[PDB]
Design an enzyme around this catalytic site. Structure first.
Site, PDB file in Angstrom:
ATOM      1  N   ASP A 106      -5.427  42.019  66.200  1.00  0.00           N
ATOM      2  CA  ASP A 106      -5.952  43.260  65.598  1.00  0.00           C
ATOM      3  C   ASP A 106      -6.418  44.262  66.668  1.00  0.00           C
ATOM      4  O   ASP A 106      -7.559  44.753  66.584  1.00  0.00           O
ATOM      5  CB  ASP A 106      -7.112  42.949  64.632  1.00  0.00           C
ATOM      6  CG  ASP A 106      -6.742  41.961  63.549  1.00  0.00           C
ATOM      7  OD1 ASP A 106      -5.668  42.126  62.913  1.00  0.00           O
ATOM      8  OD2 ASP A 106      -7.549  41.022  63.311  1.00  0.00           O
ATOM      9  N   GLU A 156      -3.362  47.163  54.548  1.00  0.00           N
ATOM     10  CA  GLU A 156      -4.566  46.983  55.360  1.00  0.00           C
ATOM     11  C   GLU A 156      -4.441  47.691  56.714  1.00  0.00           C
ATOM     12  O   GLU A 156      -3.538  48.507  56.904  1.00  0.00           O
ATOM     13  CB  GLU A 156      -4.920  45.480  55.472  1.00  0.00           C
ATOM     14  CG  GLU A 156      -3.891  44.677  56.275  1.00  0.00           C
ATOM     15  CD  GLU A 156      -3.977  43.174  56.124  1.00  0.00           C
ATOM     16  OE1 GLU A 156      -4.831  42.673  55.365  1.00  0.00           O
ATOM     17  OE2 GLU A 156      -3.151  42.499  56.792  1.00  0.00           O
TER      18      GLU A 156
END
Ligand SMILES: OC[C@@H]1O[C@H](O)[C@H](O)[C@H]1O
Ligand SMILES: OC[C@@H]1O[C@H](O)[C@H](O)[C@H]1O
Ligand SMILES: O[C@@H]1[C@@H](O)[C@@H](O)OC[C@H]1O
Ligand SMILES: O[C@@H]1[C@@H](O)[C@@H](O)OC[C@H]1O
Ligand SMILES: O[C@@H]1[C@@H](O)[C@H](O)OC[C@H]1O
Ligand SMILES: O[C@@H]1[C@@H](O)[C@H](O)OC[C@H]1O
Ligand SMILES: O[C@@H]1[C@@H](O)[C@H](O)OC[C@H]1O
Ligand SMILES: O[C@@H]1[C@@H](O)[C@H](O)OC[C@H]1O
Ligand SMILES: [Ca+2]
Ligand SMILES: [Ca+2]
Lengths: 504, 504
Positions: free
Chosen positions: B14, B177
């Protein structure tokens, strides 16, 4: 009216379908298991009955050195003028071949080997003009360009007519495969799989006015996929199309039912069904605009599992498979009538080359499986029992054995390189019942002292450590009876009185 | 000129990037590990140096009950007018928060909790007009519609200004997301991930003239994915865009390097880099038309690992992490100067709630890891050693322990429900060196008698049984030092003299 997917539950991948009149026949891949290529019958596309297997003789099915990564890959079933043709690849032999039948209730022919035709996923199409085409994939041994290859075939000789041509590379997904050629309303359709038979699996289609192309990719490819979704059905594809006798169109294909996170599946790839609609501009749409569900609309299809084998018959039921070609002398239904006698060899469940084992697919997440064994081991290496088996490195077993001259019931596991005895208890009777309760997350291993009926929980084991994702290969869990001498021939016979498979 | 992906190897998922002048800063998710949110610096986008961590105090990072399935999820790093903002979710607390810094060489602020802002993947965007927007995902606790949600934010108060609005559902992939909002050449771009952070992962983008939409989906979505390909880099996405100081555009994102079949990865999700081109019609293209490679063209970026800790310092190096918040009294660099002293508790590596453990990421497929331990266990339960650790159900360890009043060196494994002692040998010295050789397929566990230098191969273990696919969660393998009393407090101290991590 509704039906549920999968329509054939458990390890039944790469479905190919064939209509004859108002009856339907379907075949699946079988890898290292013998007999090979289960064949099913249906009248409504939903409810399938296993009629038997296509490859039942050693001449048809050479599985020495085959594993759950090899042996028999996708088979295709076709019918023309009273003859059934089954075409498939034995990946262990690296050979494509055809077997023939005029009667599915009898046996199939000797193989007709297709010399020089490589790749996997061979298919046949009988064109309306009488011409016959073989379609398949790139030959890995050679090192060909990925894609779909085609030629005219002479079926008697098993030889190619004219030239082998690359007809389509697909849309660009990996492993363009599973090709089938069809002719509908003046167009040839080439239906394929791409993305690999895992989470990237998809169905794509192209069309041409000519059987060899050029093929135009469908503008809304892929026409079926669950890639990038969290649906309970995953890895969907390897489709084959049928027109039902009411005129409606349907596809069969496989998918998985994974559990846990990341997703893991242990029931193998299972056969599913979805309707097809044709667009005004002449393209097929599968399911709900390229997605399918567990509960589906049955359209106009006419809507409509406890298995107990006491070994009274001297013929094995169609539920049973062996690991590769069985050593026939090591199994007997006649030695002690009403029991299955098995003779363990040096080979164990950790060995690829025919251990003494007979097994049936796990076809339900929730089920209870049991057997009664008579076993009096003479030596410490000697062992017989009940296994939950994925492959040679991934299996659990509850068994009778001997340790330092004492009979013990054991729970044993092989997971990758781990070989462990989980629990061991002294046992004092000549017979034992083994009982396994399966649920989605775990197997619970119990034994029963038959004369008293007293039950004892020996231990448990996780389903996910047997999943395909963990274990490798292309198959589903089997429940099996086995015997071994663990490096020596077993000097004690194993007698199994019965086997029960009871789904929830 | 070329560079290699991943640019930050090992468990670094991420990635969020932030430019300040001609220098670049990047953060990654850390789950249950403490300290949390590693932060890196670069001048060229390729070569990154870890500066430390963002969350280093218990007030910033509450990890009681956190596991490799929870704790800290994706963090986003932004800079405005001399202040750095780090925004992230503690999934164990079910809370989103911001920490602030005016100097990355010092510590970050106490959390500013964003009350009523749910979901994961919060992001900040500082608009050119001075307005500040928070963007995030659907709140699971509530049970909101899947998608990307946005509001104006007051950064001092940590409170929403005006209304929270659904701005985009994405293209239709699962788990929309990782949203980031940007403004380039008069357009707002909303960059997201879809498909889940596994084999279906992809990057999609939409644009609008207004920050709250309506957003138009890019006609060639997805703009980055390896779904349905067999590329060595998989699960690619969760991207963040930067403009380099030469004007060229780049994205960072994560991907995996799986091995085996089906694919399995054990190094976690790793940070990668790819160039961006803008189309004539105003859309971003990532990499080679939506695909990326291990070897990449560096464009005009200026192109340019043995770690040995002898525990001489009284401050832990930035390589070390603990499992949740460390019990500080159980680790000491001062008790015996030049050694790390560890005190084992009742908790073992099978327990989620802070076992005595300190560890560092496996950042290479091929490496050798070693440590010297002094350990004289007083009782049979007492144990200290070196672990290869994925999570509480998936770890291997080589250790000193006591059995029936004899000191033994052991190789132990936990894989799912299996807890096994693989090998055990009597050992006769006060100190031992443990040495693990890793390769893509296996770990080889050896010990060395330090005074003689004699080496002994104790056993081996498969990497794939520690993979994320097998183990669950969102992390990569760590190599760790640990001690335990296996249900009781350990009454013997463990002293580690040094730790060496030597990549191939
Ligand atoms: O099932 C084995 C192979 O995987 C793919 O489904 C391919 O089509 C088939 O031959
Ligand atoms: O890494 C944990 C979660 O997975 C996905 O990458 C999501 O964006 C992130 O918060
Ligand atoms: O789809 C399959 C692919 O993913 C690979 O593993 O092996 C051959 C193919 O049939
Ligand atoms: O991408 C992730 C998804 O696949 C799931 O497992 O958990 C939350 C998401 O961030
Ligand atoms: O090959 C033979 C097959 O053609 C026939 O149908 O059944 C017997 C087999 O031996
Ligand atoms: O008459 C047949 C009919 O049963 C159905 O429509 O499928 C094809 C036709 O040939
Ligand atoms: O919260 C404080 C932070 O703002 C400062 O930068 O460093 C010390 C911390 O206690
Ligand atoms: O002047 C800056 C330049 O370095 C680069 O083009 O990135 C953005 C500009 O503001
Ligand atoms: Ca019987
Ligand atoms: Ca030292």
């Amino acid at each position: 009216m509704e039906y549920s997917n999968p329509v054939i539950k458990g390890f039944y991948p790469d479905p190919s379908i064939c209509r004859v009149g108002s009856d339907y026949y379907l075949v699946t891949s079988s890898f290292q298991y013998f007999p090979g290529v289960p064949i099913f019958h249906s009248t409504n596309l939903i409810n399938w009955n296993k009629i038997g297997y296509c490859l039942i003789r050693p001449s048809q099915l050479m599985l020495n050195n085959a594993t759950n990564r090899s042996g028999i890959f996708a088979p295709t079933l076709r019918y023309h003028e009273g003859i059934f043709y089954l075409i498939t690849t034995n990946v262990t032999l690296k050979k494509n071949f055809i077997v023939m039948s005029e009667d599915l209730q009898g046996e199939w022919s000797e193989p007709i080997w297709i010399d020089g035709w490589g790749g996997i996923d061979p298919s046949l199409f009988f064109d309306n003009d009488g011409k016959v085409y073989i379609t398949g994939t790139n030959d890995n041994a050679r090192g060909e360009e990925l894609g779909i290859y085609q030629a005219e075939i002479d079926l008697k000789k098993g030889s190619i007519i004219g030239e082998r041509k690359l007809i389509w590379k697909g849309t660009g997904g990996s492993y363009p495969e599973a090709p089938h050629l069809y002719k509908v309303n003046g167009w040839y359709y080439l239906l394929i799989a791409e993305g690999g038979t895992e989470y990237g699996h998809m169905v794509t289609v192209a069309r041409s006015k000519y059987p060899f192309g050029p093929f135009e990719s469908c503008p809304f490819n892929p026409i079926l996929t669950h890639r990038s979704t969290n649906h309970p059905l995953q890895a969907i594809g390897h489709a084959d199309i049928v027109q039902y006798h009411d005129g409606s169109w349907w596809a069969v294909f496989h998918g998985t039912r994974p559990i846990s996170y990341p997703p893991k599946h242990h029931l193998g790839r299972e056969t599913c069904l979805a309707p097809i609609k044709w667009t005004d501009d002449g393209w097929p749409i599968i399911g709900y605009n390229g997605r399918i569900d567990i509960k589906m609309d049955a359209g106009y299809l006419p809507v409509k599992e406890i298995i107990e084998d006491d070994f009274n018959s001297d013929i094995f039921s169609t539920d049973w498979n062996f690991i590769q070609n069985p050593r026939l002398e090591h199994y007997s239904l006649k030695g002690r009538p009403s029991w299955l006698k098995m003779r363990g060899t040096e080979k164990t469940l950790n060995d690829i080359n025919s251990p003494t084992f007979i097994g049936r697919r796990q076809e339900h997440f929730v089920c209870n499986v049991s057997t009664l064994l008579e076993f009096k081991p003479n030596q410490d290496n000697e062992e017989a029992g009940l296994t939950v088996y994925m492959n040679e490195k991934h299996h659990y077993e509850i068994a009778l054995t001997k340790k330092n001259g004492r009979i013990n019931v054991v729970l044993k596991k092989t997971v990758g390189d781990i070989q462990v005895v989980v629990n061991s208890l002294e046992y004092f009777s000549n017979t034992i019942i083994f009982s396994i309760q399966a649920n989605p997350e775990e197997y619970k291993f119990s034994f029963v002292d038959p004369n008293t009926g007293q039950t004892y929980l020996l231990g448990t084991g996780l389903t996910t450590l047997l999943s395909t994702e963990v274990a490798g290969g292309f198959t589903g869990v089997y429940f099996g009876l086995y015997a071994t001498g663990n490096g020596k021939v077993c000097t004690a016979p194993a007698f199994f009185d019965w086997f029960k498979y009871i789904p929830e």
